Design an enzyme around this catalytic site. Structure first.
Site: not given
Lengths: 417, 416, 416, 416
Positions: A103, A143, A217-220, A223
């Site tokens: 990371k 990220d 939730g409705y991020g990428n 959705y």
């Protein structure tokens, strides 16, 4: 300071309860093997030179090159970066990738930076960390506040320093398709999650086709989990949500028109037929599949007894807390632990790297076939481990992952036992 | 953290005596590369232990970073960082084509077997191989590490490097059989004798038959006395060990004194000598005082009682800042520690030059070169102290930081 | 392509004075490697512009190729090739372990900000990285490039090289902070003074008290005047620049007229002199005339009017070949340009030696060594002209081309 | 120069059928790297002779540059440059992760022995070694180079590379014994056949029992006729040599015709065939006409007399731009040369893939992969021409240049 890292080490110590692991090996795994902190100097648009702080952590590479994203964030710390690198080692090992965990990060507020200063930063990061990264050493990725645009800038700089001597596309993933990207990257996390949701219902006898799902939730992620849960699994999406509120309507929501509304209206609230609800109404919703596709510890002690889905698929990372965990296992609820459930993302990035170092690119359908098998086999291993070792799904996932890493270390002779 | 924050503070001070842009200051405050790594060994009692190892490369504007490796249980990254930053000033003050670096391993090495020590030496190199090299970062001995460990380390580097380059030159402090340099033992003292001579010149004194006192009779102290007498023609009127001092206004002979200490365990009662105290030695009326021992021995309390014309700081840190202010106003010429005792870092540079060139110098050749190097460093610090009207210590820093800053500007790192 | 063609023709004349196979001759007429690259930069206004750069390595039998980079809006591949071919002879007449190279970018640097100029310098190294390096091809400054730009270039190289080797030595004419050499700014002029002194020695002339005139008053003209006065004991009776000359039989002070020039734009109307014309300056009865301005100032038209006992060609190509014959008929000893002004490339060699050996020389060290390279190069060429009974210029080429050709045979590049 | 000027202008034309920034246009107008090298060999004479070689890498945004090497006595840098530039749109139209490169030596290979030809293939690699390689720049055969020459070149590369990497993958068109690929010899024809099959599909034509004519009867014309018959089930009503054509409304058998041509030198007087002219072959009322010989065979003069529903441009350059407009206005679907004959570079790709993956494919696997690429490539150029309503040639540039331009933006080479 630490404590993200403290936390990571803690959950590694906990999992050493469910498997035989030597002390030697446990101690080795608590230390990231290489930690690098570098000055990342750019010249601002105004001509002043600012030195930013960047990190690249390679936790363990017993299983192969370390793999992991780069986060650009003003609250970035080495403790976070180390914690997350440690978790990457388990994440890639749970889906049997020949990778270690890695990371990176820069302590920067990127929305104070213009595009041009952002490219400088991306290129200066690579010039600073060049000697410890590489397609067979440590392979970064996007990220928080980084994306394919920055990935392309970082690749190009790596290729300039390397002098085009090797598969420089494979130095980093999440790239644009024009320069070594991979089809299937956008759907990756959701698609993998959907496969695990599928194999879960399979293991459970649940017929699924037509049955209900709610997606917190409705991020990428949210959705697309909703979309495929629907148009791929036959489910009825009876609820979703966004930061400002959720909606229900048990006849069947349509994730696109719900997305149009969301972009059209700032929120899915008020939607056509959408009996507006709370997130916890969504979490305490009676469905077949609940996918908390948003924010950590949203099912804790103070709600867990009221979680109704037969299957909790953790597309989001960290939604369910350990106390929340025990309730749900004993409730009879099957959680697909986060780092197994959302590993579809790191899996398609492995595929990106494989296409790069081999100079040959797969199709939308080839990538999904391959993702399907990985996710399927990975879920089975964790599921049978939790059955056979009679432990919670999460601990099974850790036993699967840490066993692979442990075994590799032993076979190299890193630890004698 | 405290030691590093201390090093940062010393740079911000030095920035008060010169023009340096903010962006260059902000850069010099940040070490350019920090590496923390696992350093696994198999212990003799069978366990595999992974120690924490560090290599810090503060700034390489002038050249490859140079610096020792500490094996020590109190090692913090903050100490390694502070020491790397300070080492950048040390190599710059005496005009070496180097930047500053440092390393360490967090371990108590006191009872590690020879076998575990070799394993740890080797495992350190295998962990840091990618960021070191004869033209990148050149380590050296420090706390608990020595020439023996340098040899094991060099050998491991060469083995990984496949003998493709000047591998001897990857690390200094090596045994003579494998690329070590002559002049290394007496380097600190010999370098100090050159600055003492140049200081005398600056002051208009001829040291022949003048009086020197040396506080400390380890290697540094003994050779400072011995060479002052031998080369400079001075009369060693006092020296002292940790126990106490001896005095004789017609001169002690440093060899005999060393012989005596060997037999009797102390300089005390040396035939013909008056026993004095350490703090009395400090105040003797001598042309040169060389504190070659513990730190903060000249302070606010005794600094006004110093009678030396020149105070050669052979030890590190023997004079506190209040003492600095006093000795200056008294017209006593201090040779600040990192200028005075720079013959050490200078002769370790010489070693690297010899390796990298495949050609080795004599004693006479090393001495002549050390002379030149030390002599020009003194004059640079002295003239800066005069031309800027600042303490010798602050002048040494302005000279060091100015070099690094010039190099940074000349590469385009900072525009300003 | 007339520039290259002119270079080829000159090689073909020199072959007339020595035994050289067609094999070798055909080899030497072609540049072994020619690189032309896109060098793109993001302008200050955000637009990206691709410039055209060249690097040309003519012949590396004798060692790495050496030569500068011109930033100039009428750079052509043909000039770069010509200059590269000529560099091979220059590094060889003065006996450097080098061959010849040259580079250039087609850009008017006067239209670029410093930020755009640094981007260009770095884009050039990023473009040609694979063919340059410390033991491959070592650039340097030329038309419109200077130590500032060398430092930027060295830096970008070090960065791409990952500090694996002596990156200082990839390019010369650097700022002193990052590996530059002492003796650099006066190298050409100082080099010429040594060959002037050896020419005098050959002529049996004692130059102290004798008159010198210098055409041109930039750095080379200025220091040629100053060093002849101070080192050789000569009287500087006339100097000139683009706007006119000045004469004083009793002597001129080079610094006074430089101050007058800086003040007024030209050496002209210096109060301590009378004005004369550039041609008048060329025709003075002096012991040394040093053309140090433009090419072809001594030609068929005026060569018979030259009275200088020695013509030291500080500039490139001041005398035409018609003039060569005439002056040589007249008994006038010329010091051919690429011999006379080779002190620059000799000192750039010295800089590279300091870089790759990690060890830097003093002013006086750089001087003594220059002194010997130049002196030795002179008697070589002079004794060739004497023995083979030819013009100094032809003796110079014989000496150069012989070296390069011997190295090619010794490698088995050509079989004879 | 002109060939290059022609390529630049073809690109300038392309730009008017798509959105492409001026900075990107100007970038693409320029070859990014151009190498011109001396390539010396010792003749069987014993004499050493220096040839002139080029390697041009026009754009490597999409990936390593791909393109062949030409041995030819009238080889020009402008030519190598024009072909490199063209090579970039070819590998892009067919979606290979490559950019365009090209190489050349000015030599008459026919005057070279086999021993001397090897020496020259090896010297070329010794000379361009630093700028080529499995991930930099991958050559191939071309004019007067062949698999035999590739094997010599690969070998010299592998020897300098010290077998560190997949040296087989440095150069394609290799013998099968050392990394060569199956499908190589018929790659262009087989690819033409797939595009022909798809053009037919596009037009609603079943090609079974339809007539094809093929101009030229080298490998490309031969295999096109042979596969159009065997695979596509067409009647080959006519093929042609340089001497002239032969015709038969009932069918020629491609193998018979080749045998005959082998036994006689020409196709002229093939049993049952009528001898026709090349101009008569072109004007034949067929379903598919394949110009598989020389360039500019269809022009302003004759374009209106063409009766093919499909003009498959197997050769490079067969139809002129005036002719393009005439044929298009007539409703004739051309398959532009760098799309239509792209099966060659497509199989050179598959070869490189097998080389760097150390795993080789079957005839069946090569062919299906090609089918897929050539088909997919066709539909894209096709639908571009339809959707933008432009000529298929311009559609092929729009597809290709858009790809190369998208990769440049995503690298941040050009900001807009």
């Amino acid at each position: 300071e630490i404590d993200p890292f403290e936390m990571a080490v803690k959950q590694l110590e906990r999992a050493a309860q469910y498997m035989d692991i030597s002390e030697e090996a446990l101690e080795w795994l608590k230390k990231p093997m290489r930690i690098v902190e570098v000055s990342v100097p750019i010249e601002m648009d105004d001509g002043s030179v600012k030195v930013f702080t960047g990190f690249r952590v390679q936790h363990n590479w017993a299983r192969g090159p370390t793999k992991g994203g780069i986060r650009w964030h003003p609250a970035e710390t080495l403790s976070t970066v180390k914690a997350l690198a440690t978790w990457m080692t388990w994440k890639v090992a749970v889906v049997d990738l020949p990778y270690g965990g890695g990371k990176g990060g820069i302590i920067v507020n990127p929305k104070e930076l213009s595009e041009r200063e952002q490219e400088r930063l991306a290129r200066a990061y690579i010039r600073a960390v060049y000697d410890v990264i590489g397609p067979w050493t440590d392979i970064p990725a996007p990220d928080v506040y980084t994306n394919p645009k920055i990935m392309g800038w970082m690749m190009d700089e790596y290729e300039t320093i390397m002098r085009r001597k090797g598969p420089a596309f494979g130095v980093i993933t999440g790239k644009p398709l024009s320069i070594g990207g991979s089809l299937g990257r956008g759907t990756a996390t959701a698609q993998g999650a959907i496969f695990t949701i599928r194999e879960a219902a399979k293991a459970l006898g649940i017929d699924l086709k037509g049955k209900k799902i709610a997606v917190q939730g409705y991020g990428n992620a949210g959705y697309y989990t909703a979309k495929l849960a629907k148009e791929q699994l036959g489910m009825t999406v009876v609820a979703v949500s966004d930061s400002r509120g959720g909606i229900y309507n048990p006849d069947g929501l349509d994730p696109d028109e719900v997305l149009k509304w969301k972009r059209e209206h700032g929120s899915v609230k008020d939607f056509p037929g959408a009996t507006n609800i709370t997130n916890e109404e969504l979490l305490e919703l009676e469905v077949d599949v609940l996918a908390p596709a948003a924010i950590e510890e949203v099912i804790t002690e103070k709600n867990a007894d009221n979680i109704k889905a037969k299957i909790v698929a953790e597309v989001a990372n960290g939604p369910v807390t350990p106390e929340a965990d025990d309730i749900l296992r004993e409730k009879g609820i099957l959680q697909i632990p986060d780092f197994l459930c959302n590993a579809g993302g790191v899996t398609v990035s492995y595929f990106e790297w494989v296409q790069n170092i081999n100079g040959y690119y797969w199709t939308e359908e080839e990538v999904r076939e391959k993702l399907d098998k990985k996710m399927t086999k990975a879920f089975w291993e964790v599921y049978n481990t939790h059955k056979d070792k009679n432990i919670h799904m999460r601990d099974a996932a850790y036993v699967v992952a840490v066993s692979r890493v442990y075994q590799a270390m032993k076979d190299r002779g890193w630890v004698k036992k």
